[PDB]
Design a protein around this ligand. Sequence first.
Ligand SMILES: O=C(O)c1ccc2c(c1)nc(Nc1cccc(Cl)c1)c1ccncc12
Length: 342
Amino acid sequence: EDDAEGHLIYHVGDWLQERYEIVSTLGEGTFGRVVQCVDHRRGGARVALKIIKNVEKYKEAARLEINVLEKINEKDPDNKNLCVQMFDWFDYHGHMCISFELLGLSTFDFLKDNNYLPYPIHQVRHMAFQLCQAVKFLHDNKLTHTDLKPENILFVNSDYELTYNLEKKRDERSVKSTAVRVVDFGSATFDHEHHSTIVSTRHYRAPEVILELGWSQPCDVWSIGCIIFEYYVGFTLFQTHDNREHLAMMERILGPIPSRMIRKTRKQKYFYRGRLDWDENTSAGRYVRENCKPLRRYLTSEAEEHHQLFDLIESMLEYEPAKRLTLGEALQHPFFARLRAE
Ligand SMILES: O=C(O)c1ccc2c(c1)nc(Nc1cccc(Cl)c1)c1ccncc12
């Protein structure tokens, strides 16, 4: 009973393994569909079931992800470290099905269903903290969630409040609680298993990955630095799909790539005479210089708390992966002082 592209054919009210009962669809992706379900063997707890196509490569992909979720569950027995919880998984007629705790909209969907209006800085703070907290729990267990984006950070609950802005004559949404979870472990890699060559989503991709210099945990921090910027202004920091433009935007926003990285990268067609081969006086050259600025010029306030957020973002968008801030040292960063510890 299969779709023309491999998906399960279901309707509201269908049952799965006479155990789950479909209520709604939450979304879809290339891999399959996520459905809201009631789980009558967990006393009617509401779950989110992921239904992946009959396609083998996805079936095998999910088996790897199921292993990562198994390990997360093994090393967070009290569900304190803010990665999504898998309650169950089963093979259903060639469809791999994973049972997750029910959460809300992503931090991206909310940001766009609010017209790409940034989150207020004190929300950026609790979101950034939880992000680092959860990705540090992975690093402390020899993992790299290879694919961090606002799409994969779910609000536990994205109920909000509407308020009218007298000042700016605008209807503003404000999510009530900022508890998040990190999701989508389909790409996470233990330290000891095989590493893909290219990982992450172009906009959140670290330069070491681009220059094929070898990657591990530090490349997540790069991602996190990009998501934080987006949380704070609404738009992605790097808006490209080409390597040389990408590498050129980084040089615009962060200054020149260090020579240690250049001389060592085998991607030498991007450089001439030790420097990035890029002519600012061209077609794409002045598209880059016009469409993004040095980092701290994106500051919307000289308040010291705002300078502390860009102090943070600057340390995660460091070129050299080992000069790059670690999540351990990030939970200790001055920017997170105003938070209440627990
Ligand atoms: O991959 C996971 O680990 C993963 C795990 C859980 C959820 C999820 C993705 N996506 C949700 N939303 C969503 C939104 C848009 C498209 C798609 Cl496919 C899904 C969702 C909602 C409520 N509860 C859990 C989830």
